[PDB]
């Protein structure tokens, strides 16, 4: 259309979801210059799949989703098709289908604390891997053995969410990274999110 896509609310949102409770914003009926998105500043990761970044200035999509959350630096690599590990298996999973872009940046200066900030959580245990784009916010006690926990934490009975400790002494593999994942959806419908050229 004519009006500019509201990427600022996603990318500059002051607080980010925990990865296990990752957020999704729908982008519709707008025009999206992706070269400016590159140029916001200083993205440590800007990787795309199924599309060329030098081309979706010329493309339209039915809808565009923007998922955001916080993780450790050395886990950003898990935000890609075909990855495994705690984040990919149990918190946030891209398909092998993925046509979109993964954008991330160091957020030590906003999410760390001197004694560590324990408010960002991830799911450490789950009985099976997440499906693509599935979200799990459940907090059942996790039965790692043969004894029914009955909702109480025991030796083989663990609360499923675990805390990052974001502290500035960490160094980059363990500092927090804000991640934004853009999905480009060609659904059996009109296109509403376009690049400025098309």
């Amino acid at each position, epitope marked *: 259309p004519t009006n500019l896509c509201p990427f600022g609310e996603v990318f500059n949102a002051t607080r980010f979801a925990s990865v296990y409770a990752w957020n999704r914003k729908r982008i519709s009926n707008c025009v999206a210059d992706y070269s400016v998105l590159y140029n916001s500043a200083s993205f440590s990761t800007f990787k795309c799949y199924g599309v060329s970044p030098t081309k979706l200035n010329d493309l339209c999509f039915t809808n565009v989703y923007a998922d955001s959350f916080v993780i450790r630096g050395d886990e950003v690599r898990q935000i890609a098709p075909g990855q495994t590990g705690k984040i990919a298996d149990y918190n946030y999973k891209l398909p092998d289908d993925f046509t979109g872009c993964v954008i991330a940046w160091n957020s*030590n200066n906003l999410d760390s*604390k*001197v004694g560590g900030n324990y408010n960002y959580l991830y799911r450490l245990f789950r009985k099976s891997n997440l499906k693509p784009f599935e979200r799990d916010i459940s907090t059942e006690i996790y039965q790692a053995g043969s004894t029914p926990c009955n909702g109480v934490e025991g030796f083989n009975c663990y609360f499923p969410l675990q805390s990052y400790g974001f*502290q500035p*002494t960490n160094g980059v593999g363990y500092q927090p990274y804000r991640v934004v994942v853009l999905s480009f959806e060609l659904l059996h419908a009109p296109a509403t999110v376009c690049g400025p050229h098309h």
Partner: antibody
Amino acid sequence: EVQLLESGGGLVQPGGSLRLSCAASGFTFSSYAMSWVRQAPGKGLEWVSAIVGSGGSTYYADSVKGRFIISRDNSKNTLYLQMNSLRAEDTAVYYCAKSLIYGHYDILTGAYYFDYWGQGTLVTVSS
Amino acid sequence: AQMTQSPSSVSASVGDRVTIPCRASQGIGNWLAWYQQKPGKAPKLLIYAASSLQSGVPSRFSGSGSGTDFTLTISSLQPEDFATYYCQQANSFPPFGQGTRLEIKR
């Protein structure tokens, strides 16, 4: 040009009230944490209080908890410091200051450097 | 309660290369600022993130250090550089303390 213009300082008796004001310009005020710093005669700087861009999280120095309130009007690009129950030792020059980095949501979370500083008002608590 | 410690005074002459040591509490990592104050006047941010020169600040000021030992160095002391210098942990608002007085040697 970023500017921070302070007003409201003056002379008040022990127990009184004063309201300080820090008019901000040259930047998107609502995106920056702000703080009040002061310097009593013959002592060193101390953080009085601070507040994130949204206003939703604030910090107070121990010596002033319960007695000072910090606030902002993001509409008017203005920071305030409501001071109650003033004591002699609250006598100081009060500066306001802007956070270098933008986007803090919690006042104890993140890195806090202060690039721009106001000129300061003098507050005198005496009878 | 203060989080950083630097010597009360350092004595220097124009031209000199001056260093100010600073010992921080552990667990600060990177988050160390240097501030300059002339008497009665508002302090000025010189260096942030322990080694980043702040905008508009003369290049003769530089900051280094890792862990808990940091240091501000002034390569070519100008007469306007005599002031008080503070090293400040950039989280939970520690008090400034006495800082380091940069005075003229004699």
